[PDB]
Design a binder for these strands. Structure first.
Ligand code: NA
Ligand code: NA
Length: 91
DNA sequence: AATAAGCGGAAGTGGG
DNA sequence: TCCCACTTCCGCTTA
């Protein structure tokens, strides 16, 4: 099954949830979630994964924080903003 | 207070 | 056995 960072990168490339997520600086790999429309994107992640419970942004962001140590995604000190690593972007 | 983003320890689930 | 890659739950902090 697809990994969360790849799910997000695929959405950003396809543009299918443009009102929920967007690039801030695609060259740097920085992206930002919609304050009002992030939950619809979280819901789609959980359904794609076939999880038992409804997915929420809180739980999705709990998973995102676990990438901080390995580096695929880092939190940026801006509201709802994160950054993919160069390695993730290159693939 | 009400709302919201952010945090992470701990334990549970999946598929190796 | 025991790690993967999250998921779920809970309590806390800051604005
Ligand atoms: Na967040
Ligand atoms: Na929030």
């Amino acid at each position: 099954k697809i990994r969360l960072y790849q799910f997000l990168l695929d959405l950003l490339r396809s543009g299918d949830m443009k009102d929920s997520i967007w690039w801030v600086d695609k060259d740097k790999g920085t992206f930002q979630f919609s304050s009002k429309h992030k939950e619809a994107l979280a819901h789609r992640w959980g359904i794609q994964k076939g999880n038992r419970k409804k997915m929420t942004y809180e739980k999705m962001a709990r998973a995102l924080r676990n990438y901080g140590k390995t580096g695929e995604v880092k939190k940026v000190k801006k509201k709802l903003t994160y950054q993919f690593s160069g390695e993730v972007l290159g693939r």
